[PDB]
Design a binder for this molecule. Sequence first.
Ligand SMILES: Nc1nc2c(ncn2[C@@H]2O[C@H](COP(=O)(O)OP(=O)(O)OP(=O)(O)O)[C@@H](O)[C@H]2O)c(=O)[nH]1
Ligand SMILES: [Mg+2]
Length: 218
Amino acid sequence: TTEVVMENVTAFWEEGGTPVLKDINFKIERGQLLAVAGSTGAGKTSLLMMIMGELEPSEGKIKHSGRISFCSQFSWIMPGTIKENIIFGVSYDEYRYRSVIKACQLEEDISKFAEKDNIVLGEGGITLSGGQRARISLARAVYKDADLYLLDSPFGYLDVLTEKEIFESCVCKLMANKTRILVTSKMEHLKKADKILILHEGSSYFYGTFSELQNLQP
Ligand SMILES: Nc1nc2c(ncn2[C@@H]2O[C@H](COP(=O)(O)OP(=O)(O)OP(=O)(O)O)[C@@H](O)[C@H]2O)c(=O)[nH]1
Ligand SMILES: [Mg+2]
């Protein structure tokens, strides 16, 4: 039925501090995509942290079940091959790995190296670009089997067309049956999402659909 719910959620990082989230409400059905938008400091990553149990509500209720795969907004690499970085301790399957690689446009990068998927990262040899590290980090999160994918601004350092292509091939097509929360501000992502939550300084600036928002326009 419903995969993730927040109801009247208020939370604080620090006792007696200012609330980081204020009366937040949303629901995601199984297989849907929630886009979470808002300016820096609005509370988007903190919302993800609450779903992951790192931040408890002071008011309100939260529902979520099952395993989570989390993609940080800060890309990271550990010493090892590009294949090891993407599978990252999960069991290996050639078809699944290849599908993720292709959806993240990493096939083109990998094909250029003599060592192919065995190119070694994070050990002083290859220095990856920001966009390469972001696509590897996204691929790692998408390769993991999970009930809920939390993708925190995963398109760092990508030009707008590459971002659009990967949003479509990875988030929309490859992950079509999966419950997804994507922190993103881009118009097409909000338009393709089943629901949109725009945060501003902890509060719900807007919650609904892109179509509902368009209907409010003069
Ligand atoms: N005390 C404390 N404050 C935090 C922590 N993490 C985030 N914050 C603060 O909580 C507010 C929201 O922060 P975030 O949730 O990281 O904001 P965001 O929407 O993810 O911002 P961007 O990632 O820059 O787009 C901010 O005012 C932060 O200063 C923490 O671990 N401890
Ligand atoms: Mg953040």
